[PDB]
Amino acid sequence: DTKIWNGMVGELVYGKADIAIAPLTITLVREEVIDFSKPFMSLGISIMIKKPQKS
Amino acid sequence: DTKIWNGMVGELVYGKADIAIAPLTITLVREEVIDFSKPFMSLGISIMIKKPQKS
Numbered sequence: 001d002t003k004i005w006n007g008m009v010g011e012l013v014y015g016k017a018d019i020a021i022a023p024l025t026i027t028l029v030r031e032e033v034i035d036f037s038k039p040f041m042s043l044g045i046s047i048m049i050k051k052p053q054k055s
Numbered sequence: 056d057t058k059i060w061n062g063m064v065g066e067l068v069y070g071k072a073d074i075a076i077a078p079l080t081i082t083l084v085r086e087e088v089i090d091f092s093k094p095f096m097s098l099g100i101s102i103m104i105k106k107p108q109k110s
Contacts, residue, residue, distance in 0.1 A: 038093070038094070042094075
């Protein structure tokens, strides 16, 4: 609605913060306003299930 | 010895090539001379063993 970044990006875009060292997912629209470094931690959606025991 | 980049980077640094779309591992010393994009394919060292035989 306002197209105003909240959160850490709103602290980075609006001069409130100097840098971010945080679990920030690199997306397209986030690089449109700030600059990421290269990723330090690759990840993806994973399947958490119960550890099974003796059906 | 010569500190001359061979390969695709030597084609990119020395103006021979315009861009690289190739399996190029992003390292520190490679970014010291050219600019990578964000990685399109995360990977790592994997363990190839024999598939369990059907004997």
